[PDB]
A paper describes a structure:
C‐di‐GMP turnover was increased ~8‐fold in the presence of cAMP or cGMP, further supporting the proposal that cNMPs are activators of Bd1971.
The crystal structure of full‐length Bd1971 was solved with both cAMP and cGMP ligands, to resolutions of 2.63 and 2.46 Å, respectively. The nucleotide‐bound pocket of Bd1971ΔEAL‐mid reveals cAMP to be bound in the syn conformation; of the two full‐length, bound‐state structures of Bd1971, this pose resembles the cGMP complex (syn) more closely than the cAMP complex (anti). However, both the anti‐cAMP and syn cGMP conformations allow for the side chain of Met59 to occupy the “down” rotamer that stacks with the nucleotide base, whereas the syn cAMP Bd1971ΔEAL‐mid conformation places Met59 in a conformation more similar to the full‐length apo structure. The dissociation constants for the binding of cGMP by Bd1971ΔEAL were determined as 11.38 μM and 0.769 μM for the first and second binding sites, respectively, indicating positive co‐operativity.
Numbering used by the authors:
A (entry chain B): 6 to 111, 136 to 401
B (entry chain A): 6 to 111, 117 to 123, 139 to 402
Write the structure that this text describes.
C-alpha cells in the first residue's frame, strides 16, 4: 500500500507513539530533533530508505521528527510486519540488531553461548580431539558382521566423553561441515581399506568383498557441488570400490526435490549404495522414496525400542519392512538391545541389525578384533 | 578461543580491516574516535558486551578504535560466524541491519539501492480479504464403492484477476506464515460452519437423516492458527454459535504439526476429547511424523494427489500407496485419496482398500448453491 505526502508535511514528531514504518519510493525526508525551537538535523533520507522502524521494534516513542522536504511517496510497513520478520530471524542476528538499536539511541546469553560453542567445536576438531568409531552392522539370521557405521566421537581431555546430542547438529548446519565432513569421509575410507586388507589376510575373502562402510552425509555437504568429485577422488586415493561404500543420508535431502534426485542418481550410477537414515522421523519420508536410487533404509531406534511394548509400533515397523521389500530396498533395524527384539525383527523380514546386543561403537583396533 | 589483553593495549584502530569481533568476559574497554589527536570517547563496554561486529557484517573498515582500560579477556567471534547468519537472513531484516549500521557510523542524502514487494503483496492480500474478494468453495468427498457424497472440503478462493499473477499456492502460503491467518482463519471457520449448518438442515428437510448425521465438513487448519492458544476456544464458540456437533467437523492439518512432538500430541488430544475429527492433510509429503503416528488421535489421513497421479505410471508409487492404506487400516484410520481424475485410478484405489475419494472425476470445488444441488442426486 502506497501513500503520497506533500512537501513540508510533518509525517510524525519526536515523542509520538509509533504506529508504522515507511519505505521511501520517491523523494526526500529530513530527520531532525527539536531543542527549544532550534531544529537539529540528523540526516536526509532518499529512495529505498526505511524510517520509523525504531519505535516499532521495542515499543518506545519516536526518537526523532520527520518532515517531507519535497513531495514523497511512502510504502507502509506495519508494526506486526516488522515484529514478525524480527522475531523469526536468526538469534545471533536478533542480538546484532538489539545492540545496534541500543547504541544508535545512545535472548542474549543464549546467543553468545551458541557463538562460543561453535568456536569450541571447531577448535577441538583442529586440536585433533575427534575420532571415528565403528559400530557393526550384522546379518540377523547368521549373526555375521556384514559392515559398520562410522560414528563421530569427541574425546575432550577436559570434559571426558562429550555427547553427540550436542555437537552433531551444531556441526551439520554450520559451514564447518565441509572441512569436518571431508575429514570424516577420508578417515572412514582409509579405515575401510584397512578392514578389507585385514579380512583378506585372515582368509575371509567373501566378507571383505561384501563389506559396507556406512558414512553419514549431511544435506549441506551433499548439495555442495563437487561433493561427488571429492568423494570419487578420495575413493581412488584409497583404491576402493563404490560397492563397499554406503552413503547414509537424512531424507531432508529430497526436500531439494528434483535437484537431489540429481546427485543421488549421480552416485548411484557410479555404484555407491544410498541409505535413508532415521526413516519415518524428521523429513526422512515416504513420498520421495517412490522415486529414489535407494538401496537401504534404517529403522530408527525410536521404533525398535517400542516393538515389544506398544503393538501399534510393531504394526508400523512391519509396514516399513514390507514396503522396503516391495521396492527391493533392504532394511537395517538399529537400536537393537535384546534378543527378543532381534527375533521379532527377523520374523517381520529385516535382514540387517545394529545395536548394543551385537556391539557398541568401538575404535578401529577393537573392530579389527571383532571381525576375526 | 579466549584471549587475555593487558591494560592500555589498542585492540584495533579506526580505519583498520575487520578480522573478528569479541565478547568481553572480564574487564572494560573504551570505544573512541580520534579527530586531530583529540580522543573522543563514545562508550565504555564491560562484561557481556560484544564489539567489532560491524566491520564483519558488511566488510567495511573499523568505525572506531578500541583500547583496554584494564586487563581484559575476550572471546573470539569469527567473520564466518557473522557473515553466514547475516547473508541468510530475511530481506526486511537485511534492510533493517543496513540502515542501523549506516546510521550508527554516520548534509548528504542516505539511499538504499523484492523486499518492499513482499510487504506490499501481503497488504494487497489482506485488503482483498477485507474488500470481500475471498469466498469458500466445497469439494465433495465420496464413498468409493457406492459413489455417495459423504462430506466436503472447504477450499479458499480469491475472486480477482490478481490471483492470478501471484500463483494459487502462493497466496495461501503468504496467508499461512503471516499473522493475518488468525483473522482470515476465523472467517474461514465461521463460513464453513455456517454452510455446514445449511447442508445439514437441507439434508434433514429431505429426510436424509443418516446422511446429515454422518456428514463431515473438512476445514484446513494451518500450524500457526493451530498452535495459537485459544484456537480451541474460538473453534468451540463458533460451533455453538451455529448449533453444530463436533463429530461433523473435521480439522485437516499438515503433518508438519508433529515438529512439536509431545506438545502436538496434547493439542490434538484436546480437540479429540471434544469429539472433533482430526485428519492429516498431506500425509507422506513434508514432515515425517511416523514415529508419532503410533500415538495420535488421528481419524483420517489424506493420500495427496502427488501419489495418486503416479499410481498407474510409476509402480513404486503404487507400492507406497498400498502401504499407507493398509497401515491406516491397522491403526483404525480411514483414508481419503484425493486428486482422483480418472475411473482407472478410482478402481485401483478401491481394490487397495481406500474408502473415500475426492477429485475432478466426481466433482471439482463448487459454490454452496451447486453443492446443495449435488447432494440431492
Ligand atoms: N534515532 C535515530 N533515528 C534515525 C536516525 N537516522 C534516521 N532515523 C530514523 O528516524 C526515525 C524517527 O522515528 P523512530 O525512532 O521510530 O525511527 C527513526 C529512524 O527510522 C538517527 O541517526 N538516529
Ligand atoms: N561506530 C560505533 N561503534 C561502536 C559504538 N559503541 C560501540 N561500538 C563498537 O565499536 C566497534 C568499532 O569497530 P566496528 O565498527 O567493527 O564495531 C564497532 C562496535 O562494535 C558507537 O557508538 N559507534
Ligand atoms: Mg545412522
Ligand atoms: Mg486438503
Amino acid at each position: 500500500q502506497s501513500v503520497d505526502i506533500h512537501k513540508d508535511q510533518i509525517i510524525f514528531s519526536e515523542g509520538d507513539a509509533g504506529d508504522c514504518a515507511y519505505i521511501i519510493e520517491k523523494g526526500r525526508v529530513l530527520i531532525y530533533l527539536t531543542k527549544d525551537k532550534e531544529e537539529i538535523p540528523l540526516t536526509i533520507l532518499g529512495e529505498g530508505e526505511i524510517f520509523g522502524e525504531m519505535a516499532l521494534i521495542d515499543n518506545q516513542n519516536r526518537s526523532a521528527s520527520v518532515r517531507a522536504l519535497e513531495d514523497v511517496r511512502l510504502a507502509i510497513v506495519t508494526k506486526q510486519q516488522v515484529l514478525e520478520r524480527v522475531s523469526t530471524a536468526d538469534k545471533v542476528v536478533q542480538l546484532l540488531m538489539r545492540v545496534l538499536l541500543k547504541r544508535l539511541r545512545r535472548g542474549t546469553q543464549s546467543a553468545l553461548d551458541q557463538i562460543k560453542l561453535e568456536n569450541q567445536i571447531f577448535q577441538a576438531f583442529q586440536n585433533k580431539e575427534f575420532e571415528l568409531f565403528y559400530q557393526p552392522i550384522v546379518n540377523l539370521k547368521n549373526k555375521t558382521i556384514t559392515g559398520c557405521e562410522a560414528l563421530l566421537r569427541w574425546n575432550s581431555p577436559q570434559h571426558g566423553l562429550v555427547s553427540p546430542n550436542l555437537f552433531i547438529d551444531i556441526i551439520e548446519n554450520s559451514s564447518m561441515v565441509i572441512p569436518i565432513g571431508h575429514w570424516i569421509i577420508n578417515q572412514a575410507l582409509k579405515d575401510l581399506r584397512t578392514i578389507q586388507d585385514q579380512l583378506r589376510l585372515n582368509k575371509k575373502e567373501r566378507m571383505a568383498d561384501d563389506f559396507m562402510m556406512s558414512i553419514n552425509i549431511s544435506g549441506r555437504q551433499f548439495t555442495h557441488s563437487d561433493f561427488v568429485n571429492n568423494l570419487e577422488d578420495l575413493r581412488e586415493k584409497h583404491d576402493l570400490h563404490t560397492q563397499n561404500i554406503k552413503l547414509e543420508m537424512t531424507e531432508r535431502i529430497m526436500m531439494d526435490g528434483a535437484i537431489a534426485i540429481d546427485a543421488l542418481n549421480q552416485c548411484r550410477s557410479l555404484g555407491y549404495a544410498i541409505s535413508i537414515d532415521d526413516f519415518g522421523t524428521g523429513f526422512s519420508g515416504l513420498q520421495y522414496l517412490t522415486q529414489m536410487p535407494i538401496s537401504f533404509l534404517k529403522i530408527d531406534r525410536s521404533f525398535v525400542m517400542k516393538i515389544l511394548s506398544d503393538p501399534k509400533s510393531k504394526a508400523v515397523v512391519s509396514s516399513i519392512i514390507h514396503l522396503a521389500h516391495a521396492m527391493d530396498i533392504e532394511v537395517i533395524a538399529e537400536g537393537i538391545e535384546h534378543h527378543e527384539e532381534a527375533l521379532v525383527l527377523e520374523t517381520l523380514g529385516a535382514r540387517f541389525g545394529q545395536g548394543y546386543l551385537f556391539s557398541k561403537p568401538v575404535d578401529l583396533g577393537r573392530f579389527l578384533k571383532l571381525i576375526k
